[PDB]
Structure 1
Amino acid sequence: GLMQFTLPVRLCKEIELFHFDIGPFENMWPGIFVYMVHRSCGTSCFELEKLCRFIMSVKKNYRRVPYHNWKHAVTVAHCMYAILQNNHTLFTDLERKGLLIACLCHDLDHRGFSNSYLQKFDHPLAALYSTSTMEQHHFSQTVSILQLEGHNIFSTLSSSEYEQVLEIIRKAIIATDLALYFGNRKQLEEMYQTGSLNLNNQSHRDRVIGLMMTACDLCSVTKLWPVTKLTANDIYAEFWAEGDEMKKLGIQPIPMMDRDKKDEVPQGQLGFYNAVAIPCYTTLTQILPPTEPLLKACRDNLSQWEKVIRGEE
């Protein structure tokens, strides 16, 4: 109870910034997450023994894939932490509990293949969940771990608080399906500009939390250039493996997944920054002004990819 988690001085300061990189020391990531829960939610919101056991079961259920791994889970949780700490008074006690957990669990048991590849392979999960296939699986796996003996971090919540927090986690994890992002942001853009956006309207909060999840999920594009650039390698390592698997099904994959069309990556990043990242952090900055550093960092990395195309690197 009086056992505060503390980080070394450089991490203690840099962890508060949107562009923080959790580092290459795997064995610090759990302490970094507990640190963020303690500052974000309180030392009192989870039994430390249950939290520790939950974290380690969640780690165990991420696979050793190049990108959709335990480092991604904690990276997405830190970006959420930075949004919550810069917007203290806009979120309920339960939202602060639910969302960090939602981010840690959002890619649980990912194999490094898109929903499309599951559908074209005819994977069993594609029959169980016809849309947002992996995202429904990630939520299911989250519930599975919450029901392991001594893993129920929400045990002390009321019956209705418990249903609310699991509802927050479910919607948050579903919204990480990039197919749902486009429509969610257009709606949020209209609502903001017509001045109909109302954070007391639960359906409106749902949409805003969904945008926050897309923002945290895409947060590799908001780091220092060398983090952004080296993360892109891991992202494309999965994409190209999926491209290979598409070829094995007798299907020419999209260029994004074709390791023969490696030359087209710079332009592909421009497309992605312009079609997805920039609009996401733009709309997010309009709704949550203190998140502007994400938009600023994203724009800086766009300019870096523009420099790559111009052969200045």
Structure 2
Amino acid sequence: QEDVLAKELEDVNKWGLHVFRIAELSGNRPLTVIMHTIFQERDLLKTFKIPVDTLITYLMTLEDHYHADVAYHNNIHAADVVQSTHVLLSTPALEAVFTDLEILAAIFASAIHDVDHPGVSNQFLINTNSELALMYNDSSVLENHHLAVGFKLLQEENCDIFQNLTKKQRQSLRKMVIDIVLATDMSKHMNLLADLKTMVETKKVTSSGVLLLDNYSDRIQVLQNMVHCADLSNPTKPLQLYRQWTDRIMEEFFRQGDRERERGMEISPMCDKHNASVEKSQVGFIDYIVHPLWETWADLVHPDAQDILDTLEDNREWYQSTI
């Protein structure tokens, strides 16, 4: 079983990794083994003098703080977003654009970006007067919480994977991770996409053909959109992966809708199991959210993401054909 796990992890640079199989083969430790594999692949332990036992201890504590009883926003989602960000960071149009610290920030941000997610949305938490929404003044409630937990766990015993960064490196990494995870709030999607479109329309490329990003605002904008694309990458994956993700988010959504219905609340979009059309909802999700975002990312890195976009478009056609 360890042999089969190791073979599957050889695919870590590939879009469409068998992440659900890795979750099973690793004993429900997909986030730990995928993060460890990616850190070895990118030589991040050596670069940042991360002790291996510290990395594994932190990753296993981080993974523990995802909820195994939440169908979608769990450690497998986190592992998937990590691995998807890792692939997007390797795209030819971004070669040697980002520093090792920025790479570390994007991957760490992906790993923590949904930690301790309770399986209900920000609006649900706001409208039910939850303790989380009271703490965070109704503003990026979940995303602030994910950051606070992900950083606080670094202070547990033998968990500070950043123990050997300089003070300036720690300060820069913390700021970038915050900026990235806050951009995963879906209420920011339209403004994030609008800004990404502006960047594509005005983009500059170097003599080597890679993207030119010469200020923090542009650099962090690209990393924010990269992790947001990774977060919204399920419809761009091979259909058997996409369908499993859809089964899971519909389970989580319907359970939130059941709580809304029981409380006499208006049921959130896609959350009413009695008035649901999963197929129509996926075509709409792709048409109005996922394809506008990914076609813009594809333009930013053209032609690198053409196969990903093609898969998205094929999956949209497949779902539409079932209507």
Same fold, judged at TM 0.5 (above):
yes
After superposition, what is the alpha-carbon deviation per residue over 1:43-101, rounded to whole angstroms, capped at 9, x for unaligned? 41321111001100001101121111111110100001111222341211101111111
1:108 aligns with 2:105: no
Uncovered stretches (5+) of structure 1, i.e. residues with no partner: 1-5
Q: 1:84 aligns with which of 72, 80, 89?
A: 89
Q: 2:51 aligns with which of 47, 53, 57?
A: 47
| Contact 2:97-2:212 within 8 A present in 1 as well | no
| Distance in structure 2 (CA, Å) of the matches to 1:84 and 1:245 | 39
1:269 aligns with 2:282: yes
Uncovered stretches (5+) of structure 2, i.e. residues with no partner: 205-210
| Contact 2:73-2:117 within 8 A present in 1 as well | yes
| Percent identical residues | 25
Describe the SS at the equivalent of 1:260: coil
TM-score by length of 2: 0.88
Q: Which residue of 2 aligns with 1:217?
A: 231
| Contact 1:54-1:145 within 8 A present in 2 as well | yes
Q: CA deviation at 1:42?
A: 3.2
1:278 aligns with 2:278: no
Equivalent pairs counted in the alignment come to: 303
Q: Which residue of 1 aligns with 2:319?
A: 305
Amino acid aligned to 1:218: L
Aligned runs of 1:127-138 on 2, under 5 Å? 127-129=134-136, 130-138=138-146
Amino acid aligned to 1:100: I
TM-score by length of 1: 0.91
Q: Which residue of 1 aligns with 2:187?
A: 179
Q: Which residue of 1 aligns with 2:67?
A: 63
Q: 1:191 aligns with which of 161, 185, 199?
A: 199
| Contact 2:26-2:33 within 8 A present in 1 as well | no
Which shows bigger deviation, 136-145 or 92-101?
92-101
Q: Which residue of 2 aligns with 1:3?
A: none
Residues 43 and 20 of structure 1, relative CA distance in 2, 3 Å threshold: same
Residues 207 and 226 of structure 1, relative CA distance in 2, 3 Å threshold: same
Greater helix percent: which structure?
A: 1
Q: CA deviation at 1:210?
A: 1.2
| Distance in structure 1 (CA, Å) of the matches to 2:297 and 2:111 | 21
Q: CA deviation at 1:198?
A: 5.5
Residues 168 and 293 of structure 1, relative CA distance in 2, 3 Å threshold: farther
Q: CA deviation at 1:163?
A: 0.6
After superposition, what is the alpha-carbon deviation per residue over 1:222-260, rounded to whole angstroms, capped at 9, x for unaligned? 221111112101001011111111112211313411000
Q: Which residue of 2 aligns with 1:246?
A: 260
Q: Which residue of 2 aligns with 1:34?
A: 36
| Distance in structure 2 (CA, Å) of the matches to 1:238 and 1:9 | 31
